[PDB]
């Protein structure tokens, strides 16, 4: 069923800087040692990216920051997440999300990756409940509350069963997952790349090229989206299902794409190592027009 989440600290989000991130491969054609211009939706360089946190600090009162809000979905979005305990379990995409217009769901319930585009009566506050027992050291999940009904459906995909750690790691974030979502001609194109990293509390500085992951022919109208999050329940969190919980430290970043012009550099190994935004500053604009990354 559905339960609302209480004892949370509702606060406005913050902002940070995306240093030349969100670049993905525009086509599946191999190129090497050539500068290739392109005309596609991209994340502009040094753009404002909205910061979200899922962190419950220790102390008497603390800050139970657990942010999974409904966010607008523009022509393109960029998603980045730093994870250590696999808290983010996917997203939901749709228009109204009240079983009036059909919507798609991407949920990783540990064993399988589930893609369903049905008439979902989505919950007000979707979450995934993970329980940590003390009789033994299991970390199973026993709560799955993402939607209320699945009356009419038209698409279904279940991946092969597997397992993950689901461990409450105490150290800093070590896994960086970046995602790019597009909706052109009913094809929900997803670009992703898993990259190891060693940061503390911020988006890392660097460049990365996202490989094409999978193409989803869906054909639905998407105007808003929301992110799913995990939830930890143990003997240190007494109360009912609405208050006896702890967050577990995680964070993610949400940015918006924009129709821009990019100059892409391919090395001798066939990978994108650098990019130039043609509409950022006159220096990079001159580099884009001259088609040279250098200029005398």
């Amino acid at each position, epitope marked *: 069923q559905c339960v609302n989440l209480t004892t949370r600290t509702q606060l406005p989000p913050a902002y*940070t800087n995306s240093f030349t991130r969100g670049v993905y491969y525009p086509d599946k054609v191999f190129r090497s040692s050539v500068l290739h211009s392109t005309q596609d939706l991209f994340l502009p360089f040094f753009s404002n990216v909205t910061w979200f946190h899922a962190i419950h600090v220790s102390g*008497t009162n603390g*800050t139970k*920051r657990f942010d999974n809000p409904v966010l607008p979905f523009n022509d393109g979005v960029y998603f980045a997440s730093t994870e250590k305990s696999n808290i983010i379990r996917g997203w939901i995409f749709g228009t109204t999300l009240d079983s009036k217009t059909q919507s798609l769901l991407i949920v990783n319930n540990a064993t399988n990756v589930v893609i369903k585009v049905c008439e979902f009566q989505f919950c007000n506050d979707p979450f995934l409940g993970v329980y940590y027992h003390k009789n033994n050291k299991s970390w199973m999940e026993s709560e799955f509350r993402v939607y209320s009904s699945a009356n009419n459906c038209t698409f279904e995909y279940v991946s092969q069963p597997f397992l993950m750690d689901l461990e409450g790691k105490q150290g800093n974030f070590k896994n960086l997952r970046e995602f790019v979502f597009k909706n052109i001609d009913g094809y929900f194109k997803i670009y992703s790349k898993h990259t190891p990293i*060693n940061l503390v509390r911020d988006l890392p500085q660097g460049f990365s090229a996202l490989e094409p992951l999978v193409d989803l022919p869906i054909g639905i109208n998407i105007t808003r989206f929301q992110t799913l999050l995990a939830l930890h329940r143990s003997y240190l969190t007494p109360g009912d299902s609405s208050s006896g919980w702890t967050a577990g430290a995680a964070a993610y970043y949400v940015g918006y794409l924009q129709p821009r012009t990019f100059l892409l550099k391919y090395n001798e190994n066939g990978t994108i190592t650098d990019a130039v935004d043609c509409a950022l500053d006159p220096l990079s604009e001159t580099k884009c027009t001259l088609k040279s990354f250098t200029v005398e």
Partner: antibody
Amino acid sequence: VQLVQSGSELKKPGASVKVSCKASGYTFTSYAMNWVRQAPGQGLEWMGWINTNTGNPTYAQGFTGRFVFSLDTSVSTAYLQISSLKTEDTAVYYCARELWFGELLSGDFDYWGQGTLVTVSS
Amino acid sequence: SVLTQPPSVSGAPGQRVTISCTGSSSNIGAGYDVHWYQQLPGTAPKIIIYDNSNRPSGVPDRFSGSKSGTSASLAITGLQAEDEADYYCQSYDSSLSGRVFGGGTKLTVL
């Protein structure tokens, strides 16, 4: 992420001194501004913090009135102004970066400035 | 200060030296984390352990620490010549004191 402060000043007792702190490489409105003093050959003292969004200061005990916290978002430079300088105010003042988490602040000072030396003597 | 630190410690190069720390039920016993800072002479302090167990990036593996109820401790393994500095501990007390720093402990390497 750089935290550049002002240079060293030599001031007479009973005067007033202003100390500036430049921050760069990060979104200045996202992190709270903290000020930590240190007497020579002594421990570190925390005289309070000032929010970067609303600009309201929060002084500690014994620092009310004489110490003024202010900033502006055009240049994103924090200001530290001290009035009625006395001999015991001779200390190095450090700027500390803290993430804006809410009404209850954490205890993580990730970045520190180079420090500002002020000496009150005749 | 509310947090109490030993005045100084000494040890041979290469062995293990443990620096202790004690507080009360309002700073460490209340569940707030204890942070540790390292300050070379003439330079700014540098935090080497946060949230009582975790090392930031670039911090060598020789540094380790833990907390046990009211008290907390930090461990040094394999002393060298570059460890000659002053170590400062800090935490969060109640609202009447706020942030409370330690007394400081000079580490001596023979």
